[PDB]
Amino acid sequence: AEKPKLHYFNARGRMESTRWLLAAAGVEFEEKFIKSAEDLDKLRNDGYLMFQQVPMVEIDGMKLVQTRAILNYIASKYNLYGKDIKERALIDMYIEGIADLGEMILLLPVCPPEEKDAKLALIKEKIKNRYFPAFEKVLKSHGQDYLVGNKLSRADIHLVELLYYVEELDSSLISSFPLLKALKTRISNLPTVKKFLQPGSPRKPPMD
Template sequence: MLSSRNVLLSFMICHKFVKARQQICDFHLIIRIRTSTSSGLAAGKQTLRNMAGKPKLYYFNGRGRMESIRWLLAAAGVEFEEQLIETKEYLEKLKHGGDLLFQQVPMVEMDGMKMVQSRAILNYIAAKYNLSGKDVKQRAWIDMYCEGAMDLNELIMMLPFKPADSKEKEFANIIEKATTRYFPVFEKVLKDHGQNYLVGNQLSRADIQLLETILMAEELKADILSKFPLLKAFKERISNIPTVKKFLQPGSPRKPPTDEKTVEKTRKIFA
């Protein structure tokens, strides 16, 4: 027979063995829970990303006021989808469906919103992707430069829609304003601060807007920057930013210059 001492010793050994096994089981359980939790969080984040989806752009198959939005999204490295408005009937459907706040396009569906008014859309994208400066003063300069570039941009944009008998005069007006009013301002800005970008020595919406406008002006007159060496260097520098360079390649969402066929189709849609 076992003595009381031996019985007690056996019990203590068994108890330690059971406790050790329980600790091992608890350890494995914790590992499984942590792994499951991490996987669940990762899956949750992926689900949120999938729910967010790509921005969806509603506009006709041309440049217009959507082109600056395409440029800015592309520069930010954001992929987007386009829902092209190709008939008057589809435009009317959007208007009567309540999606167009002021019954106008462009419209961008993004982050759960259906945004209209091109400047509001551009401001949102710039703020979201850190292209609107570091403080309110930088934001003010960016807005001023953007508005100036967009004034010239709009003159160029509307040229194909002008009556044939006024196009030559309007063309001369655009070249004159580009070379005496707008480009001299940007040339001086770059000269005065000696930096690579227009504001704060970092990429902003203003740089992208100016590059778009420069390239549109060069489509009218290839040597339009001949008297603006700093703008020529600026154009090359911004054009070689990887996301911008990608947007400038053939096959990108960038739209070609507006031709007569596009003008005719656009008029039918918006008549």
Template sequence: MSGKPVLHYANSRGRMEPIRWLLAAAGVEFEEKFIEKKEDLQKLKSVPMVEIDGMKMVQTRAILNYIAGKYNLYGKDLKERALIDMYVEGLADLYELVMMNIIQPADKKEEHLANALDKAANRYFPVFEKVLKDHGQDFLVGNKLSRADVSLLETILVVEECKPDALAKFPVLQSFKARISNIPNIKKFLQPGSQRKPRLQEKDLPKLMAIFY
């Protein structure tokens, strides 16, 4: 055993990608074992699964909470943890909305994406612009990196894949994106050749559908 966490999932983003992001931000090297067919999924019973510290953890939120706590990315007290949870849950809603566009029926894709981008521009990004502006610090909570910052950067980049100028009206978020992207562990994860997964393409859908459905 190498002692590295082992991640079990398909070779795609899905519900494992925020876990990859958080481990990378913590500077933790990890191994991946990709499921290739439905039989692989049936053997594991539930994914994402992460082998860490002698446990086989499932449920994305539980895994993220454990990693954040273990690597000091979860605030200094209960109040900060509550704020982090609140921000992360809100971001997860937007992230899922954008990511689910790929599986919409062809005649609904454009409308679905337009709705997701509208919510990003008019509901979610204004909130986080104000949070950062009012807080007056480099990070969302306290004055150190937390899982909320990692989640916000990941979500911004996912939205920008669909609308490159999504931050045009949000100067504070632009600064946040530049700042967090340059943190060494995160900068490394954003480089080509890292374990960050590319945006899902239509051609990849049949294989994933065969595993998960």
């Protein structure tokens, strides 16, 4: 049995959400860290990167690039992508909103120092006024433990991962959203997640 190998820098970056998805699915993976530019060029020259970039994940005989292609495959393979086309549409809608917000938090470190302030103010404004209220309303509407189909899916995983990043940004943001707090707790206690949240797991630290 082959363990998926994740090729990327030893960092959170664009590979973290995949790390969380595999860990939450209970899948064990190997990481092949890119230390130098020589490493990245070697991957390219071996014809391992379709569009010359990483993340790249070797899984089930394929060398998948593009974060979304990778996450979609894994979510499908481990039954984290809903029950049908309608459920996947809700999942996709929610996780694409999460990915818009997450793209902002992700690029924040590479943000121009002069902009680094308004950017971070924009991010917090969007979190309070757009995203958190949206997800809180979904949880509030059905009163269920999970975002979609009363069953664990990538939506819950991706959202909880994002709630940890927001917490790192400003622990006060989630305060007015009890249902999101509850979901964060509930998901963090899932055996697979808790183990990943523990020291020594493949989870990566904030980029400094």
